[PDB]
Design a protein around this nucleic acid. Structure first.
Lengths: 258, 173, 175, 148, 99
RNA sequence: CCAGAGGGCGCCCGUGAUUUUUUACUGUGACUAAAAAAGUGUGACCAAAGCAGUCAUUCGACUUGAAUUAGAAAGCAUGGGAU
RNA sequence: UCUGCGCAUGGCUCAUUACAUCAGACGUAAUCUGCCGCAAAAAUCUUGCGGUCUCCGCAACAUUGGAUAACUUGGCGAAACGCCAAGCUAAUACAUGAACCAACCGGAUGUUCUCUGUUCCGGCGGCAGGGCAACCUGCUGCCAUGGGACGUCCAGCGAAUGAAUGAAAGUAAAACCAAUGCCUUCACCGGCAGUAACACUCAGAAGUGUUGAUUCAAUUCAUUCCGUGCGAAAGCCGGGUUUUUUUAUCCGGCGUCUUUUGACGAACAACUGCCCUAUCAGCCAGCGAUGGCCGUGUAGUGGACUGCCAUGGCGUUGACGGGAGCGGGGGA
């Protein structure tokens, strides 16, 4: 059982430094995996800057002033992965974490009624006792009584105001879809095709807007909406389009002349 | 299919509310001659919603009615013919017209199916009084409590139906 | 202690493994439980799953099942006729899975006579039913041959199924 | 039913543990083996089931066709080195390793053991396909899906 | 016995000190059944049925949805059949009039 | 709320091949810890370094930045069809 | 001081070590998993009082029981992170135990009576006659593809065994046999237009689990489990209302049992790769070497191990043995 983590062996999507400190926090197990998560203390301290020190993050959280999933937390360490709404009511602000283009955690700011919306990808379906069907998700949530049309790897729109599931969205056909992991993170596009290799990983080919096709694993597909004009949730800072190295450098210079 | 509001408006507040409640989701209300409207949504999301509502409508001073697609329905089941049935009446035989005798009135009827506990009987219009005795109760024959009740359907058509059925058989062959 | 490992054993090349590691508690044999006949005695042991498993000693009763009719009743284990593994086992009347055995047979008899409202159910069940001959002869006498299809050494319950024609005819001839 | 003593030579008997085939019926009579009760299992990666498994008699608990043994990640190919042993064959893979300094390849072979289902019996020099199953002996991890 | 307080019948052991006024040392009752404790237990009793009821209610709703879909399925596969049957046969035997 | 007509894709299964068919190699693409190295930006006074900071001018702005590449075999997908 | 949680992680060191270990890729349908997250939960005959036989009748925030430390008293021993006796007294420690509240789902049925089959091919019971006691004949009553009414017993989760389920995709003639529905007449006549299911209270309250692949998930039926499984912690702390506070007036925050599956990890297995040496060329099986068969054991797969049977397995593409060495990322 591991209870310690070193800064280098920790993700640098948390944007820790080589120098200053030796350890990084190992979060308590929860909805999300160690690599894909970002621990509370990291967010509050290094990004939002409502804390300058570890101890100050305990001060805020133990007390309680912070909610995720609309539930208040007294937890110092807790995962925050993907499609999680966090709300600090003291500020009155609602963040929705996502994957920004270029592999960065996005923190995107939402209207208040969008922060009751959430999207969870389904992993398995199975029948449990009493013939009661269950969809188990990638956040470990159990949706009792899902629709009879549910399949593995589809999204379920999930009301956090009161817990239930309205209409689903499938991974079928061309639909607006975004990537999770694999270093095509936050890049958005239509499904062009879904290749099958049975007994092995199923490739899928995505085509983003303004062309430039590419390939990513089925496992890394996470649906957004029916269409780009039917999206239920906001996009991060960049729209889900990447640009060439040359153009990055060019634009960096142009703005620096101001 | 789209539904038919009845018994409201006339309209004045009707018309106002009709264009006030568009959209999100709320149909649109096409007011007409007397006191009723057509309400146009095509999908048949509308037929499902209309059940659970009694919001998205107000009244000026009327009893609202949300009716399926055609204007009439409810007078037709209620009255003009009868038509009668009796349900506690399983299987295990009474026999024939002991049934009819018990309920009084004049003939014609059968029991069906295997299912279960009903028989069905055609008697005129005045049977409206007869059943309004035995549903009111009554409450026994054989080992089981009872009810009788109505809605119309055939006849009307059923005799001419089965006529054209026997006819059809010969035609086919 | 006792271990289950390939690291005290010769390779396919006839060479010998060399060690660098002291044995784990993850790998872990324990001494075999001996289920026989006599008074029931059950000594638990704690296991790695955080739960207990039960060491059957001296089970003289089992929950037996009759094939084809989807039933079962308890009855008493009397003798062991046969086993695949050894003759030695059979003589001590040890009970381990896939031993042929002998049972009281009484409840099965009782049941099959029940297999005015009642009376016509019988006549319907008598119809479209038959039984093997070698079965019925034994079942008349009040002894039967069965097999124990649960492992009693790690559950401390001995459950078995009753032999039917194809397989019965084999074990019979081995005696 | 009745015994088939062609199969049997054991002191334990052998039965198929998946499905009861020991019921007496006249529905196993006047038929070679087709009407007799069997268990059958598809392998869904494109390995078509043989006739033999489906209609057969043979009782084996270490082949995927008549047992709950399953086919998983790895699938490899290799020839037949020897047919020796009972229900166990010996496969020889051969491939090429590369060495950077000399810019030149070398031939290196893995001599491996496998459990060959009694359905198949490939001759020396034939090519075999083999899947990834749970351990079955000390050395044996594989099973024979198909034969060329 | 029962029906009678235990709360003023606890031992009162006077303890005495110089330069400070005397105190009385007496025990808590930790097995005392009180208003609060009893209230809580009542709430347990109530809610323990409620959840289980509501689960069942959800089930009844869900199963109805399955039913509605299979209903409209039936309705179509009866409809199409009954329509095509009579229309077909009619057309056939009417074509023999002009033939 | 189209009889008929050939159908046209999608999905799953069954059947059929005179002998289906592969691999090296190559192009492209997936999948792959950080530190280290190559590298982009930046006057820590310069510099080894660091991932910082910089600007109006106040009761914040930059949607602040923290790019990107390589990383033996072996395994993965898909083009090519000379050797 | 009792109770709960953690102390197995971090830290430090390279001795063993060459089919080991490790790195990239891969599987665990062969398994375990506290804390954490989303969740699930209808078995339970109890408590109090009165009479009274250990039996009944009522009443129902359930009103449960017994010890042990600190402590006190006597102390012991050269010392000891050494210890003793007696008396005390706590619980979210320990041991008991929850009727009513209570839905829904079936099977086994009963010497309960109510419709019933306007007949005889069968069975059962009783009586009489004959009898080789095996059996035959005559008469009477009941039942025969049916449903109601009433009574009784088993029914939950987890685990064991047997059995069933966990669809299917090789054209459309039109009775031939029994059951049975609908249409139809008056009929137990004729006839096949209609048709999810449907001889009840529900005329849709699952006819349909996920997987490339399952003996898996789950459902049903029959027997089970005996402590080694299942308390609403018989738990704690607050916010008020509302004066009479001290009250079944309501709500909040914590805490725990069991079941369920994601996460954090644990434990196995394998594809590919790795320094020198032949003046190290044969190595392996009594006592497991290679495999098959049946069991045993383990959380689990397996010669991991017992018994039985078979005679294999590896090698100049360097086995086996010896020497040097923790492996990799990486340094020069």
């Amino acid at each position: 059982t591991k209870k310690h983590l070193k800064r280098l062996y920790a993700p640098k999507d948390w944007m820790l430094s080589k120098l200053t400190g030796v350890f990084a926090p190992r979060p308590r197990a929860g909805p999300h995996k160690l690599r894909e998560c970002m621990t509370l203390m990291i967010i509050i301290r290094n990004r939002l800057k409502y804390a300058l020190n570890a101890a100050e993050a305990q001060m805020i959280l133990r007390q309680g002033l912070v909610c995720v999933d609309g539930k208040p937390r007294k937890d110092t360490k807790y995962p925050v992965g993907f499609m999680d709404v966090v709300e600090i009511p003291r500020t009155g602000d609602r963040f929705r974490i996502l994957y920004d283009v270029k592999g960065r955690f996005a923190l995107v700011k939402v209207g208040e009624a969008e922060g009751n919306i959430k999207l969870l990808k389904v992993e398995n379906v199975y029948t449990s006792t009493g013939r009661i069907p269950v969809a188990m998700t990638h956040d470990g949530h159990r949706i009792r009584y899902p629709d009879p049309r549910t399949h593995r790897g589809d999204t379920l729109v999930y009301n956090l105001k009161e817990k239930k599931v309205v209409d689903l969205i499938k991974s079928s056909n061309g639909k607006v879809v975004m990537v999770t992991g694999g270093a095509n993170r936050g890049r958005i596009g239509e499904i062009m095709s879904i290749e099958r290799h049975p007994g092995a990983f199923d490739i899928a080919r995505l085509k983003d807007a303004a062309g430039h096709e590419f390939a990513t694993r089925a496992s890394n597909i996470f649906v957004i909406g029916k269409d780009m004009q039917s999206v239920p949730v906001t996009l991060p800072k960049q729209q889900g389009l990447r640009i060439n190295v040359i153009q990055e450098r060019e634009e960096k210079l142009i703005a620096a002349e101001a | 299919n789209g539904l038919y509001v009845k018994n409201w408006g006339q309209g004045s507040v009707d018309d106002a509310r009709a264009l006030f409640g568009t959209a999100g989701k709320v149909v649109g209300v096409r007011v007409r001659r007397r006191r009723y409207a057509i309400i146009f949504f095509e999908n048949a999301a509308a037929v499902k919603k209309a059940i659970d509502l009694f919001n998205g409508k107000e009244f000026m001073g009327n009893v609202l009615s949300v009716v399926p697609a055609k204007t009439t329905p409810k007078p037709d089941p209620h009255a003009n013919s009868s038509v009668v049935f009796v349900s506690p009446i399983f299987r295990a035989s009474t026999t024939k017209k002991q049934i009819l005798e018990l309920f009084s009135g004049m003939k014609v009827l059968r029991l069906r199916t295997y299912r279960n506990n009903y028989a069905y009987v055609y008697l005129d219009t005045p049977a409206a009084a007869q059943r309004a005795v035995k549903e009111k109760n009554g409450a026994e024959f054989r080992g089981k409590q009872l009810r009788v009740a109505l809605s119309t359907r055939s006849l009307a058509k059923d005799r001419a139906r089965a006529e054209r059925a026997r006819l059809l058989m010969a035609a086919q062959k | 202690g006792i271990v289950r490992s390939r690291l005290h054993k010769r390779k396919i090349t006839g060479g010998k493994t060399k060690i660098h590691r002291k044995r784990m508690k993850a790998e872990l044999g324990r001494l075999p439980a001996h289920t026989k006949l006599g008074a029931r005695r059950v000594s638990p042991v704690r296991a790695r799953g955080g739960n207990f498993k039960l060491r059957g000693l001296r089970l003289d009763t089992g929950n037996f099942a009759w094939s084809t009719e989807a039933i079962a009743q308890r009855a008493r284990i009397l003798d062991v006729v046969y086993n695949a593994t050894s003759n030695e086992l059979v003589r001590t009347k040890t009970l381990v899975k896939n031993c042929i055995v002998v049972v009281d047979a009484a409840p099965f008899k009782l049941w099959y006579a029940k297999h005015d409202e009642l009376k016509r159910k019988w006549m319907l069940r008598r119809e479209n039913h038959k039984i093997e001959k070698a079965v019925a002869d034994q079942l008349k006498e009040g002894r039967l041959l069965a097999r124990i299809t649960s492992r009693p050494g790690q559950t401390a319950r001995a459950d078995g199924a009753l032999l039917e024609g194809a397989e019965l005819q084999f074990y019979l001839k081995k005696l | 039913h009745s015994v088939d003593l062609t199969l049997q030579h054991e002191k334990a008997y052998q039965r198929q543990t998946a499905v009861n085939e020991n019921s007496h019926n006249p529905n196993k009579k006047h038929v070679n083996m087709s009407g007799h009760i069997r268990y059958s299992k598809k392998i869904g990666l494109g390995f078509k089931t043989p006739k033999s498994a489906i209609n057969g008699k043979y009782i084996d608990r270490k082949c995927p066709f008549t047992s709950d043994v399953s086919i998983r990640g790895r699938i490899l190919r290799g020839v037949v080195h020897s047919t020796k042993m009972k229900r166990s064959i010996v496969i020889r893979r051969d491939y090429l390793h590369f060495i950077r300094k000399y810019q030149r390849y070398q031939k290196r072979h893995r001599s491996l053991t496998v459990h060959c289902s009694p359905c198949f019996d490939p001759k020396p020099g034939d090519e075999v396909i083999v899947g990834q199953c749970r351990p079955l002996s000390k050395t044996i991890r594989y099973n024979v899906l198909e034969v060329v | 016995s029962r029906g009678d307080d235990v709360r003023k019948y606890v031992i009162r052991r006077k303890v005495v000190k110089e330069g400070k006024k005397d105190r009385f040392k007496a025990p808590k009752i930790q097995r005392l059944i009180t208003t609060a404790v009893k209230a809580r237990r009542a709430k347990k009793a109530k809610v323990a049925i409620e959840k289980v009821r509501k689960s069942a209610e959800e089930r009844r709703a869900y199963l109805h949805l399955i039913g509605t879909r299979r209903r409209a399925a039936r309705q179509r596969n009866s409809a199409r059949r009954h329509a095509h049957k009579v229309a077909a046969q009619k057309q056939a035997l009417a074509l023999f009039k002009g033939k």
